[PDB]
Structure 1
């Protein structure tokens, strides 16, 4: 017996009223598929949302441990297993996902087959194992037949575009996603829908359309119970306030930390956000990470040093940052900090160039503001704001 059902039966010996509470929580309408689930091995709810909501209702502290056991025990060819693979990916439960994947790639069901391979393509692209060109050739070679996977094959390319700083393809790619054509797996449709709101909030942030950003993240929140999406919605809300409302941006980051105390990844993400926030407002920055050699962390070290006129320390940092390799968005930021160290307009224009390449209208405000402080002509600034890169 899987740990989840040992637990809910011993919990039922001691309280009988749980049966109708669990049946409401799972939206089951009558405890009969709940009897079925507890008494017969391999019996599966119809929608994965039922046991997830029970596990979150009754056993939240233990959610990972209980569904790592439930998920790695399901029949991989079933609909629950396919749902489990989406559950795994959305929570960054890569240990449950990679095992589910390398068992669906080999299995006998051609619907779980393709879920497996598409998610494998995703996870190889994420870990820089294959190029963007490999990913799209392997997906095309797959002849995707499910509506779920034609949705997710575009979702995975959006994730890659977002993390590489290649924002200009995203608005067009996301508009082709149509989730209303998923009729089979309502767990996958509800979760994918949450991914889109989160991504759409991301796209509107990089378009400097900040109210629509906050509105999309907020719809994202009201739509989900997955902690990962809540994390990135509070992150996105707070980033949208970076230039306008220090207190409210900080409040959103702290909210994200408070719900993610367990996780070291989520902890560092909000910590890095608070670090950029305090550098932007030129405040004392307790969130610098000095024992790191990632570009994000070294740039925030330079930025703070620059803010406090420690140009030797800043130049040393920017010396290190030179012997490293930047994506476009990262180079924009690099040129911006070089412009503030050396007070050189050409670094700010170089910074504007790469911001234009990556189609980031949000952070391009940092070089634009510095150029105006240097008395740059306002018409030229207008013209910079309106011209685009190829």
Structure 2
């Protein structure tokens, strides 16, 4: 509780300069100490990338064994997040390296989960989670606590994709009470926001707006809320100030295209949707792609196709969008239920 005392001081007494103060104090610290090891978490759980990358360098080449470990493991995690490497090579590098610390045993498991979630590839997550135990960490109480929040958040997403919405919110809410890290707060609110998309427009917007407030300041955290607010509004067919028209990202384009649909410009929506079709996209994105086509043409093939991609993606929340459409075209309700489950 050296590091912890330092962070708690800055957080309370100098709040709106936290990053300036904690940068200096982190970069000064000796790699070998617990504080430096504790600091690495602070840096990464906050997504302060440059600072995390700097701390990695110092710690990768260091006398203490634990610090050497942390350096090497976060080295992988940050190569994975920047997308220098794929999931498969990350899994090999954890298998190759021999993990001695109980903490880095726990953190190694969570490494791929981040990539899965980003890539829409939801199938592997559930199984990977069950093995982890948080009492295997009983050494460094700061690293123990942030990992609690990390797991509460990851599960909040896992149950979201499993279409266990009451549970998703439970876990996000847990995460919120457990932390005052912005990023964890940001993603808690994102996931509660997402959990209500179909349930209740109002509560979705509340949770997405409340997170949006916390996110302002950060270019990257804003973008998630803006994208989800676009989606929310386009799906409920409401006024939509959230759209970014100057983005090539398939998910921003997808938001444009969803907007024209709501404004009934189906020729222009069709043209642009065909331009996305062969572009690089994860399967979950194709889930939406064909759902969009289904709205334009009203062809069952599109909706059938959209279901197939969500099925591949194992996205049990968003599979219901094409399934509802298919029900309204007089498809056998029982067969559609079999798909939903």
Q: 1:254 aligns with which of 203, 209, 212?
A: 209
Q: Write out aligned runs for 1:209-224 (5 A).
A: 209-224=164-179
Alpha-carbon offset, residue 370 of structure 1 = 0.9
Alignment pair present for 1:59 and 2:18: no
Aligned to 1:116: 71
Q: Measure the CA separation in 2 of the matches of 1:47 and 1:187.
A: 10
Alignment pair present for 1:159 and 2:114: yes
Q: Write out aligned runs for 1:358-373 (5 A).
A: 358-373=313-328
The answer to whether the 8 Å contact 2:320/2:340 transfers is: no
Alignment pair present for 1:203 and 2:119: no
Q: Measure the CA separation in 2 of the matches of 1:272 and 1:93.
A: 22
Q: Measure the CA separation in 2 of the matches of 1:270 and 1:212.
A: 21
**Stretch deviating more after TM superposition (311-320 or 105-114):** 311-320
| Equivalent residue pairs, number | 341
Alignment pair present for 1:129 and 2:90: no
Alpha-carbon offset, residue 313 of structure 1 = 2.0
Q: Measure the CA separation in 1 of the matches of 2:206 and 2:242.
A: 15
Aligned to 1:348: 303
Aligned to 1:292: 247
**Stretch deviating more after TM superposition (94-103 or 252-261):** 252-261
Q: Measure the CA separation in 2 of the matches of 1:358 and 1:150.
A: 27
Alpha-carbon offset, residue 47 of structure 1 = 4.8
Alignment pair present for 1:194 and 2:173: no
Q: 1:376 aligns with which of 320, 331, 334?
A: 331
In our comparison, the structure showing a higher alpha carbon Rg is 1
For residue 158 of structure 1, give the secondary structure of its aligned residue in structure 2: helix
Q: Measure the CA separation in 1 of the matches of 2:200 and 2:334.
A: 28
Q: Measure the CA separation in 2 of the matches of 1:49 and 1:317.
A: 51
Alignment pair present for 1:324 and 2:293: no
Alignment pair present for 1:227 and 2:170: no
Alpha-carbon offset, residue 141 of structure 1 = 1.5
For residue 180 of structure 1, give the secondary structure of its aligned residue in structure 2: coil
Gaps of 5+ in 2: none
**Stretch deviating more after TM superposition (226-235 or 256-265):** 256-265
Alignment pair present for 1:103 and 2:69: no
Q: Which structure's relative contact order is higher, taking Cα pairs within 8 Å and 6+ residues apart? A: 2
Gaps of 5+ in 1: 1-45
Q: If the length of structure 1 is used for normalisation, what is the TM-score?
A: 0.85
Alpha-carbon offset, residue 259 of structure 1 = 1.8
Alpha-carbon offset, residue 113 of structure 1 = 0.8
Q: Measure the CA separation in 2 of the matches of 1:168 and 1:126.
A: 19
Alignment pair present for 1:339 and 2:255: no
Cα displacement string for residues 148-198 of structure 1 (whole angstroms, at most 9, x for unaligned residues):
111111111111111111111111111111111112111100000100000
Q: Measure the CA separation in 2 of the matches of 1:272 and 1:342.
A: 25
Q: Measure the CA separation in 1 of the matches of 2:242 and 2:114.
A: 27
The answer to whether the 8 Å contact 2:243/2:255 transfers is: yes
The answer to whether the 8 Å contact 1:301/1:317 transfers is: no
Root mean square deviation of aligned Cα:
1.1
Q: Measure the CA separation in 2 of the matches of 1:274 and 1:343.
A: 25
